[PDB]
Amino acid sequence: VVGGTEAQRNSWPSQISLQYRSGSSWAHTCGGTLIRQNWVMTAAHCVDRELTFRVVVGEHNLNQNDGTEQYVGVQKIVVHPYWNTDDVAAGYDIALLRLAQSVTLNSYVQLGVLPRAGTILANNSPCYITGWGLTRTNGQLAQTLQQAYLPTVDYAICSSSSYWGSTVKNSMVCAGGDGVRSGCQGDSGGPLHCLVNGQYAVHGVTSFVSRLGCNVTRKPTVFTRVSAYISWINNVIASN
Ligand SMILES: [Ca+2]
């Protein structure tokens, strides 16, 4: 997250760190959202590589013992069947991870609430991106979980020629684009939390930013629109 602030450690209890095994260590690669005690929602592109993955819930500082973490293996990966890694602009950037164990819920570990199917946010709706991704274009991962305020940019604006044009689909949410705040590498897969009727819900799965840079004016961060995938999510969990 570029232009973020450090989150409070109990603000975003559905955020997870998706990590892969790297020698005798683990490396953070992506975010995700805990949606059942044994299921995480992330981006498909986060799991294109043939890596060994784990999920960390209750994580605040990637580099320090928080005293709240639970570490759990990924048992099964179900990528959306229309996903193509060489066509991120086509959409379908979503995957579900079945965890090897059910995590225990507490003030640091909670299920993310998803919107009702079909819900579309008004332009300029209040949202936060969260993650441990780079804090500058071509920078380094955050140590502590970051948040940034990224108001939505509706489809008509986002898909206009000075924004993303044809690259953005109605199956996506755009947010931000102010040139200061954005998602960045290592945020992919994580949530966009939007305040609706007094409740935050996870409306987005972080999918991409511009090849030119993370915080680029009129290139808002692009997310998979969770409300387009409710039936798919429910069907995968019910069949697995
Ligand atoms: Ca930690």
How far, in Å, are 34, 55, 72, 76, 150 from residue 38 at the CA level? 8, 10, 9, 10, 29
Residues 122 and 89 in one domain: no
94 shares a domain with 135: no
160 domain-assigned = yes
Is residue 191 within 8 A of residue 112, CB to CB? The reply is yes
Q: What is the whole-number distance in angstroms between the Cα of residue 213 and the centre of ligand 1?
A: 28
10 in a structural domain? no
Residues 116 and 203 in one domain: yes
55 CA to centre of ligand 1 in angstroms: 12
Residues 116 and 218 in one domain: yes
- What are all long-range contacts of 105-110, with beta carbons under 8 Å and residues at least 24 apart? 105/37, 106/13, 106/58, 106/68, 107/10, 107/13, 108/9, 108/10, 108/13, 108/57, 108/58, 108/60, 108/66, 108/68, 109/13, 109/34, 109/57, 109/58, 109/68, 109/70, 110/13, 110/14, 110/34
Resolution of the coordinates in A? 1.2
Q: Does residue 46 lie within any of the structural domains? A: yes
Establish whether 84 is an annotated binding residue: no
- The active-site residue, picked from 125, 188, 207, 210, is 188
Q: Which of 93, 193, 207, 227 is catalytic?
A: 93
Same domain, 211 and 119: yes
Q: Are residues 121 and 219 in the same domain?
A: yes
Residues 36 and 47 in one domain: yes
Q: Is residue 74 part of a domain?
A: yes
- The catalytically annotated residue of 17, 28, 45, 207 is 45
The rounded distance, in Å, linking the Cα atoms of 95 and 39 is: 10
Domain count, the chain: 2
Would you say 69 is a known binding-site residue? yes
Cβ-based burial of 71 (10 A; exposed 0-12, middle 13-18, buried ≥19): middle
Distance CA(83)–CA(42), nearest Å, equals 13
> Would you state the structure tokens that stand for residue 19, as one six-digit string?
């990590």
118 and 105 in a common domain: no
Output DSSP code: residue 122.
P
Distance (Å) from CA 175 to ligand 1 centroid: 28
Please check whether residue 171 lies inside any domain of the structure.
yes
| Residue 7 falls inside a structural domain | no
How was this structure determined? It was done by X-ray
222 and 142 in a single domain? The answer is yes
Residues 42, 134 within the same domain: no
Asked if residue 118 and residue 81 are part of one domain, the reply reads no
Has 146 been labeled as part of a binding site?
no
Q: What is the CATH number of the domain that holds 192?
A: 2.40.10.10
Quick check: is 87 catalytic? no
Q: Tell me, in angstroms, the distance from the centre of ligand 1 to residue 29's CA.
A: 15
Q: How far is the CA of 195 from the centre of ligand 1 (A)?
A: 27
Q: Is 28 a catalytic site residue?
A: no
| 9 part of a folded domain | no
Is 93 assigned a catalytic role? Answer: yes
Tokens matching residue 162: 């000075």
Can you give the residue range of the structural domain that contains 167? Answer: 112-227
Do the annotations mark residue 61 as ligand-binding? yes
Q: Are residues 133 and 40 in the same domain?
A: no
For residue 1, being part of any structural domain is answered with no
182 CB burial (10 A radius; 0-12, 13-18, 19+): buried
